[PDB]
Amino acid sequence: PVALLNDIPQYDPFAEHRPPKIADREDEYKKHRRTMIISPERLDPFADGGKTPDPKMNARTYMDVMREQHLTKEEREIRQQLAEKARNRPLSDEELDAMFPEGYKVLPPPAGYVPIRTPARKLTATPTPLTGFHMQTEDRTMKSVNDQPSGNLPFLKPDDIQYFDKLLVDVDESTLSPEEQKERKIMKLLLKIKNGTPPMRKAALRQITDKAREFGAGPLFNQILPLLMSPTLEDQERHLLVKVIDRILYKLDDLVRPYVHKILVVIEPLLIDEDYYARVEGREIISNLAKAAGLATMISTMRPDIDNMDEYVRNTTARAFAVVASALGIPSLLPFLKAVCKSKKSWQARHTGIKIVQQIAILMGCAILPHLRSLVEIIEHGLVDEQQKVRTISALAIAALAEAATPYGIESFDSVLKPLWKGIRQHRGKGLAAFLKAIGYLIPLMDAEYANYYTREVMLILIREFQSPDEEMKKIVLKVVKQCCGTDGVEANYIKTEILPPFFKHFWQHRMALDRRNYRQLVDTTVELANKVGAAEIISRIVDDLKDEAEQYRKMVMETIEKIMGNLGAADIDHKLEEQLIDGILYAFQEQTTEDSVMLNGFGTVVNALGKRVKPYLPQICGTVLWRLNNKSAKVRQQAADLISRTAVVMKTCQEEKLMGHLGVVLYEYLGEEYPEVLGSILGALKAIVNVIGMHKMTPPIKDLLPRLTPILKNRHEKVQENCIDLVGRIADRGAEYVSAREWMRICFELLELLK
């Protein structure tokens, strides 16, 4: 059955080795990133000092752009209408001339080749479904075809052929009588930047950034921007290309005035992106763009996109707007805002303006205070609107503003406490969540004779939303509870009676731990509730979870317990509680599948907070650490040498002679470990003991310790080199006479190569 062996039950196998591409992190919404095209050429209005314009330009202007847009909107309109009546959609002659470049001759071969096409599509059902040994006739052509740019250029991949194919055919320069074409080719050293060794990159970068002005904007961006829109471009390539745009954007200051919209169409997607550095870089170059091409250009350029019909570009334009507002100043942009957000034909523009306002609050932060009232009046017409969406976004923008103006501006918000507080009661669903966020953020900013009434009203709604399934709902009430039930104007017993029970029933679940923002938010409000109701209560509620199966969950409860006891201290921890606490601590320490300092700092802080009440447990602690020091896997041995270095203060201050000499000399015995990561932590533990029990009574005397370390100095690994020279620095500084002059000269000579 060898045919069965050729038959495979159920291609490129190198995937595991290739660097990830950006276009793979995408969704159906970010997949709209390539569906955008470079617009044709755009006339700048400030050319010839404000010329009287000679028409017959072929260079678009504001009017042309708006006519295109509204025409297309009517296009979609009638398409949907006709579709009620009844991408691959074929295209026309000028579509084809609009997408193809120049140097091209268009032809149906015959009127019969057009008629062949007519029969070809019609019936292709096979009219006859149509070798042997032949000897070959030697030739040269396949040898003669070349596909790599001859010269000292990098390797040109099999898809950027589209962008760099002009480099492949080589002919003399003076044949190319367009010097525009000559500089075009020489500027396709973009390849040497995109792909290249670091020397090639450095040299080409300097070249382009010096020759930028001579090259001119047009050529540059015409080559650079399709690259940035290429679908297969991965991460480092994009970072290099945007760094290029950055430097030439700084050298050409004004000359970008016609290309600002193209640059934006390409850079905007960086603003909503998962890579934090992508967002920061996009923000930074949009800032430099706004500074270089002044206000009027930016305003005129990005106005037609507020009213766009793709939420994608509405959103990214909003964020870009907030960036240019940060860069140029609100007072200069504020009239334009008022305008757009009070536009009355389209609610899309109202939404987008209110959203720009939200983003300004998010970004500029503190600097909105001088304009706070102007912004709030811009926005308060939205809390009353009838279209539910813009109501919700106005409430969100109010919450953003309040957060950006913590305690201040309350008399500016004064106008707005009413629309919220009544929207709260007679609202239900999502607006409820949004208005709740808003009122919660205002509650801190308020004087007590206001906050008391508002709070005691709101907590009523809150208690009801503790059972809400919605994920945004739950996250909002977590934030709110943290603010509302965590002021100076509440009374502990009410919390202890009415908030804690359903709080712990509905919020401490495994789903929360699993989420990444809900994790920290739940940790924070639990620490706040601790601050009010005392530690003992919260702790006694969650100690039994230090023995839970989900590690992420144990680590949530360890992070809170640790933060709490760090703040409050353990004065109220009774006996049975400190018992269950030390037990859960130990167990959680003994199960770490992961690598993380959570349980380590938990142990450290809990122990150094119990202080001297931890005497009766040092034998269990010490015994466990010695036993885990002898285990078969280097993760647990290394974690047990960490715990020693942390509790090295307690174990001494409670006069552990048996146990402390135990630790000193046991560690000295382990000093031969062959796992660098375990040895570094052994050395850290030794130095932690040397710090508390001084030089002249260390159990392995310094006279035996230092000779044991001088051969370790050659270890070339960073963790062990770190800890080793710290220990030898202590000894050289303080011990320094338990050693011979010749040992010190030996160590001199061994140090001269840690300078590496």
Binding site: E579, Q580, D583, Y587
Partner: peptide, 13 residues
Amino acid sequence: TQSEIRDIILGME
């Protein structure tokens, strides 16, 4: 606690 559990299982506490 773990020691308590051990004792319960082994014999009398």
